[PDB]
Amino acid sequence: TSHCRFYENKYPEIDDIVMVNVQQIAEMGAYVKLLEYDNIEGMILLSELSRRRIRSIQKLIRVGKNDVAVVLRVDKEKGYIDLSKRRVSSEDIIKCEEKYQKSKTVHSILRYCAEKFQIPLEELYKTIAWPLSRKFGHAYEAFKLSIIDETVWEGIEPPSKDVLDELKNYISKRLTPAVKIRADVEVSCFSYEGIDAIKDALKSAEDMSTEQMQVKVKLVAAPLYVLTTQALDKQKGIEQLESAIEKITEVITKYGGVCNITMPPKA
């Protein structure tokens, strides 16, 4: 029971960019289904099909696959779509490819949710997806902040709480990303004692490791020491590793040696 379109209104809009699964081709193109809005079909017309000249009709369509699309005039009376494929900007295709995949994942999760709860998708998107899209602009960003922050479900009225529990479990299992921020610090020392200073630096860099983020400067060479961190929020590893670099500098400036940075902390 797959239904319940991705965005606010059932019908396409003015100059909107979508994507289409194609099934059938009669004479003037293909009146074929959508999977960005409900499940309605639309005309792709041959004069407005491809950039090159239309040499073949079978190759460029690829029945049963995903394709770019733009709607010109929406038949907001009965459910018809006039649709285009040629006039989508090269930068526009890829950004819609995002929007489309963005929309698809939320449905992929809430499908599993409905099929396991046998509640029609319409009610689930009504109760959950639409308030999330209203609050955060995208249900995908709402899901990501749900992984981080629990307060995303406050102000929402699920049809049942077990839906929330299983959705949270499935999102923590499937939508799990902890980005590895890594850096390299070059020891350019020529000084008196360097290995004791390095041990002190490693201890002072490793005792700082928190419960959630643990920093281990691993060895791959003498000058080049590698700093690996698991940034849970993609914004704390930077400050951790900057503090680490400051502490390395505090170490090196007085024993006699010198060190330099080769790569700073990067995601």
Binding site: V187, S188, C189, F190, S191, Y192, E193, G194, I195, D196, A197, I198, K199, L202, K203, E206, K216, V217, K218, L219, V220, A221, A222, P223, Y225, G257
Partner: protein, 470 residues
């Protein structure tokens, strides 16, 4: 049904094993071949000289069994910049009945004091006459400072000549003259190829090799047919080493010193740095006993350049953590060989070719850094290493002011500029710091055919000193 490893173990136990060195032995009575010294350290440094693509590490491997790394991907096959090493022990059979030529046998350092005799029929046991270290030298025409530094290290020579090739190899003559330069006279001639060459070609190559070495300084150099892969005529090599080559006078009456040629950063990748090791400099001790626990400094060390362009030389004091030699960590170091001194020197300092040709001294001495040096130099008449196709081997020219010359003071590789040229004396300005200890036999090379070419010898007579900054 005893496994081979347990068999080697019972052999090691029956051989006496490797006893630990005494912590503080009476150093007045310790001769270089004492059991406390020779069972766990090499005392004579033997180097292999020869033309490229002749096989020098293979010969030492057939003698000893220890491989010479041959690292750096590209250098896995062509030529190696840094010196290759192998430990060898000379075990002589105690039984008189077995023939003398096969009594000698060269074994790995991992062997024990008294290993069993492998000849079929001889129950007797071997006696370790001496441990010998092998300082392999690059044999190429571009890498020239490395072989001169190795010659500064080594104490006995093995010359390598191919049989089926041309007799008058120029690289071998260059090596022989270079060894002749620094008061070293014990060279043994070794014919690499004997299997693939005939009986009368054997006499012809013998005669050619004899005719080559008639006017040089070395006159009584033995010749031996050897094979690097057949693993034969190894015992006679050890015999010649034992008989012809004595120990030069070296005792503990002299002040301690060090000459580092290789750098080694002990930094095991992947493991936690909470368990890490120090920095190891590979150095020869030409004079002075060394022990576990010392304060030692390299003299040129940190070479910095200020905003005014003057060169500042910071000596690098370091507390030695260990003195690795042979196979086991030792408690006393026997001078006259390369020992890996592992100290608190920063690991990055021992990473690259940074500790290549640098003098080091223990606390209680003050070697002097010099920036302008007065040398007394002598030249040969013809260049060595050039293959002129039948015309008057390149004649050596007289020196010119303001030219870059590679002036290898012992192990140091310096590009000096000439200030004044006399008939026998000269002055050199060194942007790369050099130091003076006593006399420091020097080698000289220049640039005409691109790569460096040896010309003659030099000895320091005077210089301008730069006080190390505390």
């Amino acid at each position: 049904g005893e496994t081979e490893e347990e068999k080697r173990k019972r052999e090691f136990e029956e051989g006496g094993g490797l006893p630990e060195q005494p912590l503080n032995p009476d150093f007045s009575k310790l001769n270089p071949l004492s059991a406390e010294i020779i069972n766990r350290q090499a005392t004579i440094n033997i180097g292999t000289i020869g033309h490229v693509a002749h096989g020098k590490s293979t010969v030492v491997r057939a003698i000893s069994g220890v491989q010479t790394v041959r690292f750096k991907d590209e250098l896995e096959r062509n030529i190696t910049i840094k010196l290759g090493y192998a430990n060898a022990k000379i075990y002589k059979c105690q039984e008189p009945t077995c023939p003398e030529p096969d009594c000698y046998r060269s074994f790995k350092s991992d062997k024990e004091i008294s290993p069993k005799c492998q000849r079929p029929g001889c129950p007797g046991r071997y006696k370790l006459v001496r441990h010998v270290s092998f300082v392999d030298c690059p044999g190429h025409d571009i890498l020239m400072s490395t072989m001169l530094s190795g010659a500064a290290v080594m104490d006995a020579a093995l010359l390598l000549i191919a049989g089926n090739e041309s007799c008058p190899q120029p690289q071998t003559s260059e090596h022989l003259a270079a060894i002749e330069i620094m008061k070293l006279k014990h060279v043994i001639i070794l014919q690499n190829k004997v299997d693939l060459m005939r009986e009368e070609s054997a006499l012809e190559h013998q005669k050619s090799i004899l005719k080559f070495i008639r006017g040089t300084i070395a006159d009584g150099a033995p010749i031996v047919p050897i094979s690097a892969q057949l693993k034969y005529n190894i015992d006679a090599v050890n015999e010649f080493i034992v008989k012809t080559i004595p120990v030069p006078p070296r005792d503990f009456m002299i002040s301690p010193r060090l000459i580092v040629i290789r750098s080694f950063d002990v930094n095991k990748p992947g493991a936690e740095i909470e368990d890490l090791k120090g920095g190891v400099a590979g150095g020869s001790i030409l004079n002075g006993v060394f022990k576990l626990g010392d304060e030692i400094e390299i003299r040129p060390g940190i070479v910095t350049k200020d905003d005014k362009g003057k060169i500042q030389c910071k000596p690098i004091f370091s507390n030695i953590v260990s003195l690795f030699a042979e196979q086991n960590d030792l408690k006393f170091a026997v001078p006259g060989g390369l020992i890996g001194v592992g100290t608190k020197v920063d690991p990055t300092l021992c990473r690259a070719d940074r500790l290549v040709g640098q003098v080091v001294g223990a606390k209680g001495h003050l070697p002097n850094i010099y920036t302008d040096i007065e040398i007394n130099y002598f030249l040969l008449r013809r260049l060595l290493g050039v293959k002129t196709d039948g015309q008057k081997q390149a004649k050596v020219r007289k020196l010119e002011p303001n030219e870059v010359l590679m002036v290898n003071i012992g192990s140091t590789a310096t590009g000096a500029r000439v200030v004044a040229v006399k008939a026998d004396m000269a002055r050199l300005q060194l942007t790369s710091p050099a130091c003076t200890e006593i006399n420091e036999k020097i080698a000289l090379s220049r640039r005409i055919e691109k790569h460096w070419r040896l010309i003659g010898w030099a000895t320091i007579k005077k210089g301008t000193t730069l006080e190390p900054i505390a």
